[PDB]
Design a protein around this ligand. Sequence first.
Ligand SMILES: COc1cccc(Cn2ccc3ccc(-c4cc(N)[nH]n4)cc32)c1
Ligand SMILES: COc1cccc(Cn2ccc3ccc(-c4cc(N)[nH]n4)cc32)c1
Lengths: 206, 215
Amino acid sequence: SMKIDVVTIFPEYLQPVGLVDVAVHDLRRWTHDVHKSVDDSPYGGGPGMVMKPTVWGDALDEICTSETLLVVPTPAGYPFTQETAWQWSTEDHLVIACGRYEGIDQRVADDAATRMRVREVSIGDYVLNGGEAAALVIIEAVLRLVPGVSLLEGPSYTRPPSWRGMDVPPVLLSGDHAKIAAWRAEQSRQRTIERRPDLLGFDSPT
Amino acid sequence: SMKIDVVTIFPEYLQPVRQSLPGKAIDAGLVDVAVHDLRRWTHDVHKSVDDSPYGGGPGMVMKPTVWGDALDEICTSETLLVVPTPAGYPFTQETAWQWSTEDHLVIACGRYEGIDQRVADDAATRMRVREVSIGDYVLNGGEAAALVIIEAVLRLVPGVLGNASLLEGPSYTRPPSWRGMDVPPVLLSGDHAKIAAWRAEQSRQRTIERRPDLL
Ligand SMILES: COc1cccc(Cn2ccc3ccc(-c4cc(N)[nH]n4)cc32)c1
Ligand SMILES: COc1cccc(Cn2ccc3ccc(-c4cc(N)[nH]n4)cc32)c1
């Protein structure tokens, strides 16, 4: 059984979501001023804004326990991989803190780490506008592994066997499991070399 | 302008990002994102979009005839067809930059075990097709990947999303002291050359600790 809490200033963005419950919380519910200002300019200068630690601290205080795995998406995170998804799949409680602006004051994660396990993670080498899309990716990747729910995949085909003058590879129609297993292995390793040579320990392109 | 068409059996999944589009950018015709239910192009009363894999195996494969009709209607020769897949080339910030000046992206979201390969192969004979992965994990389908790609691309298109190597280091804001933790004094020093050097060193350390692959 798993509980996932997502904290965000944009709850509605999380709407794309019995053994697991997922709850979404509006970070602004923990503000005290009438303007509900969650951000301010960075110490030391620079463009953009930083989310204040105070509002986050109060939210996480209420939502997290010492058992919680606090997940913080960030372009500067450790990589979130399939191995990470397997590791997190057996957790009782994930809390996903979604940043906006130019991110969250580092002290939020540092404070939380005195009380619970904290994981700053990146879902890939591109920049999002906030943590919400990363939260959706993480949730989907994790939940499909939850109990009771290498090489690149080769191409797949289904009916009809000829379409627009393009044939399904004859071996797949042959019913010869060994030859089919072999052809699929060759396709996979061929695809991995071309698209992801790093997975086989070769240099990346360009 | 950039037009993005997304084709999916779960059109509701793409609703958040339709919402996240500022009225100004739409009104200025800078961007238009449309979402299409794939079942609109099914042939049968059961609106079937999947069928068993040739050569056997687990799961199901999406039907080429349905996808072919969908893409025939939606794409032109000028379309960049984006097909999320765990077996794709890596989608990176470089990709996002390249795609940000495209006139027309069409994102084909698969489910089950993916789309019959002939769909992409046929499309590639008359338009640019890009099969891409957004990271080394497996999703249930292409929709979350489409959300990521749309966000990463559109935030690079001037004035669209409302937003305006080494890893970025830690950031701090008010208050100067919080739960026993002080903002690093250097940041309040007014020595901006020293601050830049401190930030550079933080970036170097973080990259070493978290992403040694970048070094
Ligand atoms: C914090 O440093 C940042 C620097 C510039 C922009 C942003 C935007 N932003 C805000 C919160 C946030 C959370 C996650 C992500 C993210 C993660 C991955 N893998 N890509 N993008 C991006 C986020 C942050
Ligand atoms: C096609 O090969 C597959 C093999 C096993 C499962 C699935 C699930 N699935 C279906 C359609 C689909 C589209 C994209 C993705 C995806 C992309 C990234 N980076 N992770 N996951 C996953 C998808 C597909």
